[PDB]
Symmetry: none
Subunit: 373 residues, 2 copies
């Protein structure tokens, strides 16, 4: 893989994300760096209006434009939701909305905060010579103090990285159905299932670095979007760029390319049929960075690893395939238990809707098991 | 173009659809082939309810699966809507629901009748040695006597095929862009406009073979589906396959790859924001064969033909590209005239939503012209 922007260490993550912009954009940076205080002391909105409609033309490298997106995306959340408890803005200042939409169009992503922004691009190592681990790592932005947003963002990223180990064997698998090499394929599927089993370990860390109550009271606010949102029913107005309100969806790990590309690899009927779930997940592809959506595209047009395996009447082969499917059921099964703790309960002091979505995706995964006959 | 399943001469249409099934399946063929007589005599349902569960395992190749889908899809519409004076069936008998659904799953299509069924796979040459012309062609199934379904399907299909020739030239377009080959690119763009222009002469045939009254009051019922339909608010029950009612959209030529493909190639933004029109056309992609779905998808991963033309300050290129865009505008403007005669007019002797839709799509196409006028 090359023009798909998949790092070999860091998979779908942005390889070594920028921390600072051209100082020509200090107005922007300062707000973002101080988002907890500004939101708390209501001076946030006040400052966004204060700013000047800057030009995105002083952003030369991809890496810098991604940071800008994460910067603007973050401000935009805080401006719309404010302190979080109801005072919602329906118009976005031209001085921030025009540059944001211009940069967004340039990048083929929607002008709203997206997984690829605040997980894949929103991080650094504390020490550059120690390894990519939780304790050697930090985020670049949070919404509130004690919003638990480091735990959430980093544990996500860590899983994204555990996954890259498997993404590297994706071409091996394709070449092996091609060259008809059965022994290589089996090894390859095994390597994959192994990598996905390790990524279940990483998941456990959620419990260590995220508190249910802080998580649910706070992070939920800043992940909401303006598509099927009661609080903004018509969508949002981007002053300057759009005449009308536009509906864009809030944050979803459905936007992760890791789990979408395994669904596709193993030919899990993830986006076929037409239940809400298959719809939604398809839409989230338009909220992935173009090269990743393209990479998904290319896998779908290769031929089905499920079909191959199905058609070969080779039990050992069947079993490698099942190892994979089983591993992916564990992840989703663990993720659901996490959702009970960090969402279902806190909400007991909307949600079942989210459960149904999860269970449906988990179910489809499970119905993919081969030796279920 | 390789196994995007696009024919040299027939494009997205099925190359030589099979008219007959295996003998094992005569009980299906009988009903399908006599839909108009069974409905009218009030004994279609009973003939269906009296049917054996049949395995799909004697349908071995793609063509016969596609045929079987056509057969079962027709029966389903017939069974559900009966005569369409309002006595709906909300539950699809196991002996039908189950195979249809299995086959649908095997072909990654929703289990409801689609454009790829009724149009792309529902035809035959009368004399094989003679060319593809209305006169030399017939459909395999219709629903009522004087439904004009023949004229409807056959003329769409001729339009479809007319645009085939333009499809052949897509690869040349991409090759010419990257080789930086200005004269060739010009020739190819002109060549595409030529095909779209001719596809419009084809569209004229609609008047000769479809009658407004019958089209509106008869065909419209069997093309209706169960997504957001007041008559089936929760959708259909596919008996013995889903412990739940499923919502699927009725036939839409939004499911035609052809018009979506040129929208993509030309960089017309048929996903302008999250506007209803945009979302809907995206939805309809899921109701197309997967090969064809991939094709649209992989076009989106090539460099914009539009960016390339805007960047080059070449009047003769801008006019070639504009000719292509005009041609589409024409088709769509003719199509609205046609909608007026065949739906708005009968309608008044709901339909305002169809207009908004079509008008938005026309409008989007128009705002794509480089010369503003
Ligand atoms: C506090 C911890 C977490 C909570 C409360 C949580 C909650 C949820 C919820 C509610 C959804 C539903 C989709 C949506 O609303 O858009 C979801 C989807 C998802 N989450 Fe999480 N999540 C957590 C951590 C993680 C982590 C660390 C990952 C790993 C990258 C992850 C991966 C996913 C994926 C891939 C989906 C998409 C659905 C699927 O493929 O099964 N989540 N999450
Ligand atoms: C009796 C003649 C026709 C009538 C009454 C008619 C009606 C309609 C209606 C109501 C729509 C609205 C979208 C929807 O509900 O799915 C539509 C869309 C469409 N029709 Fe037709 N149609 C006719 C003939 C044709 C023919 C011959 C073609 C050629 C393939 C065609 C191509 C389309 C396309 C591509 C769309 C999607 C909108 C677009 O891309 O511009 N239609 N049609
Ligand atoms: C920009 C961005 C997108 C995705 C992620 C991310 C990383 S891992 C993961 N799993 N899901 C997600 S985003 C969906 C989500 O958490 N929704 C949700 C959360 C809390 C709630 C709630 C719904 O309703 C009640 O409180 N995500 C992080 C950032
Ligand atoms: C299975 C199948 C799919 C598409 C086509 C097809 C071929 S060309 C074309 N253009 N549109 C369409 S399908 C959409 C449609 O007919 N909608 C509609 C809405 C209200 C109406 C009405 C029609 O008739 C009276 O009231 N279509 C034919 C069959």
């Amino acid at each position: 893989s090359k023009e798909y922007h998949i790092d070999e260490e860091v998979g779908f993550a942005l390889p070594n994300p920028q921390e600072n912009l051209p100082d020509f954009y200090n107005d922007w940076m300062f707000i973002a760096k101080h988002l907890p205080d500004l939101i708390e002391s209501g001076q946030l909105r006040e400052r966004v209006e204060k700013l000047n409609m800057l030009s995105i033309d002083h952003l030369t490298d991809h890496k810098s434009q991604r940071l800008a997106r994460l910067v603007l995306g973050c401000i935009t959340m805080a401006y719309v939701w404010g302190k979080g408890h109801g005072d919602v803005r329906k118009v976005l200042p031209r001085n921030i909305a025009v540059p944001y939409c211009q940069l967004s169009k340039k990048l083929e992503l929607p002008p709203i905060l997206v997984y690829a922004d605040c997980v894949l691009a929103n991080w650094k190592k504390k020490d550059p010579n120690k390894p990519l681990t939780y304790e050697n790592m930090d985020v670049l932005f949070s919404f509130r103090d004690g919003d638990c947003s480091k735990g959430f963002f980093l544990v996500s990223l860590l899983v994204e990285i555990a996954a890259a180990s498997a993404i590297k064997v994706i071409p091996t698998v394709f070449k092996a159905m091609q060259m008809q090499e059965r022994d290589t394929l089996l090894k390859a599927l095994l390597e994959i299932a192994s990598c996905l089993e390790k990524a279940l370990q990483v998941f456990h860390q959620i419990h260590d670095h995220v508190n249910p109550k802080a998580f649910f009271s706070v992070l939920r606010i800043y992940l909401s979007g303006w598509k099927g949102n009661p609080q903004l029913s018509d969508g949002l107005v981007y002053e300057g760029f759009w005449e009308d309100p536009k509906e864009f969806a809030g944050g979803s790990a459905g936007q992760s390319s890791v789990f979408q590309c395994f669904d596709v690899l193993l030919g899990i009927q993830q986006t076929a049929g037409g239940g809400h779930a298959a719809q939604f997940l398809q839409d989230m592809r338009r909220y992935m960075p173009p090269a990743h959506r393209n990479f998904l595209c290319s896998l779908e047009s290769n031929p089905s690893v499920r079909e191959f395996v199905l058609s070969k009447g080779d039990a050992g082969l069947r079993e490698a395939y099942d190892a994979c499917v089983k591993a992916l059921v564990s992840l989703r099964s663990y993720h659901l238990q996490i959702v009970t703790k960090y969402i279902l309960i806190p909400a007991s002091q909307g949600g079942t809707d989210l459960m149904n979505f999860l269970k449906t995706v988990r179910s489809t995964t499970e119905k993919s098991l081969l030796k279920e006959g």
